[PDB]
Structures are given as structure tokens and as C-alpha cells.
Amino acid sequence: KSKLPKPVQDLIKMIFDVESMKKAMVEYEIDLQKMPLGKLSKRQIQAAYSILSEVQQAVSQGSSDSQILDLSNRFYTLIPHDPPLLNNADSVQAKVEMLDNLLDIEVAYSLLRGGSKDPIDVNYEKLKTDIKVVDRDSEEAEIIRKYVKNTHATTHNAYDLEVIDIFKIEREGECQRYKPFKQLHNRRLLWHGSRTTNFAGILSQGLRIAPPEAPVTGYMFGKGIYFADMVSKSANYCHTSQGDPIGLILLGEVALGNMYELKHASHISKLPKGKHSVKGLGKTTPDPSANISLDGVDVPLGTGISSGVNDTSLLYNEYIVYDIAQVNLKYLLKLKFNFK
Numbered sequence: 001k002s003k004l005p006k007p008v009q010d011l012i013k014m015i016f017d018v019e020s021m022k023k024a025m026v027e028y029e030i031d032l033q034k035m036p037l038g039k040l041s042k043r044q045i046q047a048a049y050s051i052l053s054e055v056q057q058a059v060s061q062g063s064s065d066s067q068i069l070d071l072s073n074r075f076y077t078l079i080p081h082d083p084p085l086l087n088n089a090d091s092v093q094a095k096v097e098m099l100d101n102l103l104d105i106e107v108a109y110s111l112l113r114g115g116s117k118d119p120i121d122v123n124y125e126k127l128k129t130d131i132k133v134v135d136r137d138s139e140e141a142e143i144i145r146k147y148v149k150n151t152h153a154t155t156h157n158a159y160d161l162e163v164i165d166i167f168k169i170e171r172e173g174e175c176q177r178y179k180p181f182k183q184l185h186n187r188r189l190l191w192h193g194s195r196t197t198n199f200a201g202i203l204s205q206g207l208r209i210a211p212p213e214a215p216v217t218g219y220m221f222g223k224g225i226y227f228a229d230m231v232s233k234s235a236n237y238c239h240t241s242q243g244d245p246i247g248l249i250l251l252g253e254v255a256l257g258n259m260y261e262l263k264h265a266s267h268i269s270k271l272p273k274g275k276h277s278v279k280g281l282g283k284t285t286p287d288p289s290a291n292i293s294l295d296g297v298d299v300p301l302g303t304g305i306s307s308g309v310n311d312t313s314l315l316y317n318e319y320i321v322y323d324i325a326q327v328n329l330k331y332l333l334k335l336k337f338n339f340k
């Protein structure tokens with residue numbers, strides 16, 4: 001049996017569930033016959049990003065129907081489906097999203113196949129990630145639950161949110177990596193939602209930035225790591241429905257430094273001198289007054305009020321850093337989405 005607390009065990013079971021890895025591949029219409037879980041590779045997914053960039057190159061340079069046809073055939077040969085022609089940005093970005101997921105799904109599966117005590121404990125160790133349970137009645141839980149209740153958006157009213165488990169997390173190497181970036185202040189505790197099938201990869205390797213091979217557009221603020229101060233904006237990237245009421249989310253410590261504050265999409269080739277992050281400005285913001293501190297870290301847990309920011313792409317804020325070392329992952333939440 002396992003020495004880990006039941007909540008930690010149930011987390012490992014959820015993160016390394018091989019069924020749900022398969023299920024999402026079916027959802028993406030991958031031919032599991034032509035390509036099962038075992039046959040996914042980094043090199044395969046890498047070249048598929050490159051084909052997608054080539055599609056976008058062609059579309060912008062307005063290539064001929066057969067040149068676009070050739071490229072789609074190459075893509076669907078590299079990633080066999082059970083299909084949409086890739087001729088516009090929207091279909092290309094749909095495929096990026098898939099590859100991002102599959103990239104993580106591959107990482108999760110490579111972990112189980114590696115290595116030689118309960119399987120649960122052996123798995124936990126492959127994560128190189130300290131996971132401890134935060135007690136329901138603790139100070140951390142009171143603040144976290146308030147952060148959740150208060151930063152739930154009014155337009156995200158298709159579900160109610162309930163915190164089931166809260167975990168203190170410490171990724172191996174991350175602290176040594178993060179230390180120098182504490183020098184810039186404006187450190188804040190922020191949300192990052194993702195698919196459950198991604199979390200094995202997220203804990204093994206932390207939050208990573210898009211690979212250079214991937215196509216450049218689709219990204220509002222370039223290739224960086226993206227955060228929210230409203231819980232539900234991040235909760236939407238959990239992609240949970242009826243069959244999955246359980247999602248996972250991260251609270252991370254982000255060292256924002258001097259924020260380059262924007263209202264419209266820009267392709268951040270380079271941050272301006274003395275700027276260390278980007279903040280997209282929403283129509284709705286957490287109350288600036290109600291900001292709280294937790295262990296030297298600012299927590300924007302105020303009820304979302306109307307910010308006077310007009311003529312902006314975004315309804316809610318978002319934060320983006322461009323060095324992976326600027327993130328320190330602190331908490332992992334398990335959430336029940338209670339639908340209606």
C-alpha cells in the first residue's frame with residue numbers, strides 16, 4: 001500500500017489515468033489504431049508544429065490550392081485521424097491546441113514507461129514534486145477559498161465552483177531557479193488553469209513557453225506563460241463538462257517586475273527596457289483596495305469590480321511572463337465544477 005495521504009493518492013490516480021489520456025485522443029479524432037499512446041514522440045509533435053507554421057506561411061503568402069492541400073496531407077500523415085482542410089488561422093490554431101495537449105500527454109506516458117511499494121508512490125516520485133495537503137481550516141485555505149469565491153466572474157455563470165482539495169507544491173529545482181527573479185518585486189499569486197491530462201507534464205517540467213517550431217499567431221501577447229487574477233477565466237482552460245466535473249488549477253507566484261500594460265494584442269518580440277512582464281487590461285478587475293498579502297506575496301483576491309478601462313479586447317485581466325524562471329508554483333487546487 002501507499003504512505004501518501006488519500007488526497008495525494010487520488011491526485012496521482014487522476015494525473016496518471018491512462019484511460020483519460022486515450023479518451024482525449026479519441027476526442028481529437030486521432031486514429032488510435034494507427035497511433036496509440038505508446039507511439040507518440042517529441043520529434044513527431046515537433047515536426048507537426050513545423051508543418052503548421054508552414055501552413056500559416058503559405059496562407060499569409062496566399063499559396064495555391066494544391067500547395068495548401070499538400071501540407072494538410074503531410075499533417076494528417078504525421079498525425080493520423082479517423083477532416084478539416086488547414087487553410088485559415090482558426091483551423092491551424094485548433095491544431096496547435098491539440099498538439100500542446102498531446103505534447104503533455106506524451107510526457108505523462110513516457111514517465112510511466114520509465115523507471116523500474118505501491119505504483120502510486122513510485123509515480124509520485126517521477127514527478128520530482130513535493131505535494132503536501134493544506135488543511136481545510138488553515139489560514140492558507142481561508143484565503144485561497146476567498147480568492148476563489150471573490151474572483152469568480154459574472155459572465156462565467158454556467159457553473160458554480162467548489163474547492164475540494166488544496167495542495168502545497170514544491171517542484172524540484174524551481175526555487176534555486178526562481179531566487180534571482182525575486183529582486184524584481186511586484187510578486188503576485190496568480191491563476192493558471194490547464195487540462196487534467198497536462199498536469200503530469202506541468203509538475204515534471206513546470207510551466208513551459210511554446211516551442212520556437214510552433215506558429216506565432218493565435219497568441220494575444222506572444223509566446224509566454226499566461227496567468228489570470230479571476231479564478232473562472234483560468235477555470236475555463238480546465239475544459240470540464242458533464243462527464244468531468246473535477247478540474248485542476250494552479251496558484252503560482254509570478255515575479256512580474258515592471259508590467260508593460262496593454263489593451264490590444266501585440267507580438268512581443270522584445271520587452272521594452274525596464275519592463276519584465278505584460279499585463280492585459282480587462283473591463284473587469286479585482287477590487288484594487290481589497291488586496292491581501294500572504295508570505296510576502298500580493299494576493300489580488302478582491303471581488304471583481306468594473307474597471308474604468310474602455311476600448312479593450314479583454315473582459316478580464318491577464319499576466320504574461322517570458323522567462324520560465326519567473327514562475328514559482330505554490331498551490332494546486334482540485335475543483336468541482338457544479339453545472340447548471
Ligand SMILES: NC(=O)c1cc(F)cc2c1C(=O)N(C1CCN(C3CCC(F)(F)CC3)CC1)C2
Nearest residue numbers: 093096097192193217218219226227228234318
Ligand atoms: N492558463 C491560464 O489560466 C490562462 C489564463 C489567462 F488569463 C489567459 C490565458 C491562459 C492561457 O492558458 N492562455 C493560453 C490559451 C491558448 N492560447 C493560444 C490559442 C491559439 C494558439 F494558436 F493555439 C496559440 C495558443 C495561448 C494562451 C491564455
